[PDB]
């Protein structure tokens, strides 16, 4: 309830606004504030976890949205997890092979429980999933943050909800329909596409950092050797769509049983056709 939380640290920062680690009831937890210019993002993720009942040990857990005086602010405020990004994460350590297929295993799991209809819930797509939007818990699963894209669809009466924020998502992470805008917006299977492409690409952020037959790689975002520190869209259209480039797999993968599975895996997430593409689910199966 926002006006009992002390402010301690900046953990994060840009154009949407901060995250700070607070202290609210003797417990870190993190504070979102939004920017004026990103109020809507606020508006969506408000709108998702207190009328979809998001309970999932893979999908950041929400305690408050609140707006406070500091003069308005809009604040969400949910659990505060001290390792960080997934994207601060892979920097700072190298993985086994136990702890790699947890984190992807955990994420697919999240991913899934978002985009399937089910105390129910509609189906969810992300839109802007990332390795700065995944959290590592400290028992070693992740969880999914950032509901301001969602998109959600009922079965029932067939009505997809698209919100109305103009928020344009993350441009290293889009999908190749996206990028040349033939992408059917009134479609909801079009959303969950381009969930599965951007989950590909963290699954090959996150392969790269295993270490198998003692060597291991540098983390690096996808696409670091084809697009500068935030690319343009024309940037982001000429790798993935007219030249058809995908994240090359190291050699060393095809000599390890897990990353040679999750090379397949990534593979089956970057087919130009975006209904090819593997569902959720059936990764979130293989992983086990
Ligand atoms: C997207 C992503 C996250 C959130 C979060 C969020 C929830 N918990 N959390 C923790 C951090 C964080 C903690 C510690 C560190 N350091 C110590 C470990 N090594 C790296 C530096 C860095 C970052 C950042 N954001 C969050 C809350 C609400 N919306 C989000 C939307």
Redo the contacts with the bound molecule.
């Keep these: 309830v926002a006006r009992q939380i002390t402010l301690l640290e900046c ?2 920062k840009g154009r949407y606004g901060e ?1 700070w ?1 607070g202290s609210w009831q003797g417990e870190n937890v ?1 504070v ?1 504030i939004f920017s004026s210019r990103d109020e809507k993002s606020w508006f969506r993720e408000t709108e998702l976890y207190n009328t979809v009942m998001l309970r999932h040990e893979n999908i ?1 857990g929400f305690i408050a949205s609140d707006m406070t005086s500091r003069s308005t602010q809009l604040w ?1 405020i ?8 997934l994207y ?2 892979l920097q ?1 350590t190298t993985l086994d092979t136990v702890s790699c297929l947890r984190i992807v295993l955990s994420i697919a799991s999240g991913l899934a429980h978002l985009h399937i209809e089910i105390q129910g819930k509609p189906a969810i797509a992300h839109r802007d999933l990332k390795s ?2 995944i ?1 590592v818990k400290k028992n070693g699963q992740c969880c999914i ?2 509901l301001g894209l969602a998109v959600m669809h009922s079965q029932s009466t067939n009505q997809l909800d698209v919100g109305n924020n103009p928020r344009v998502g993350t441009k290293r992470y889009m999908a190749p329909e996206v990028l040349d805008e033939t992408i059917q917006v009134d479609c909801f299977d079009s959303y969950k596409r381009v969930d599965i492409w951007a989950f590909g690409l963290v699954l090959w952020e996150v392969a790269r950092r295993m270490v198998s037959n003692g060597i291991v790689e540098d983390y690096k975002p996808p696409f670091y050797d084809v697009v500068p520190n935030d690319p343009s869209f024309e940037d982001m259209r000429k790798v993935v769509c007219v030249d058809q480039q995908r994240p090359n797999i190291p050699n060393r993968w095809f000599s390890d049983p897990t990353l040679t599975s999750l090379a397949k895996l990534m593979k089956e997430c970057w087919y130009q056709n975006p209904s090819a593409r593997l569902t959720a689910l059936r990764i979130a199966a293989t992983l086990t």
């Design positions: 953990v994060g995250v680690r993190a979102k950041l969400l949910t659990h505060y997890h001290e390792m960080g990004s601060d994460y700072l700065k939007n959290l943050a950032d």
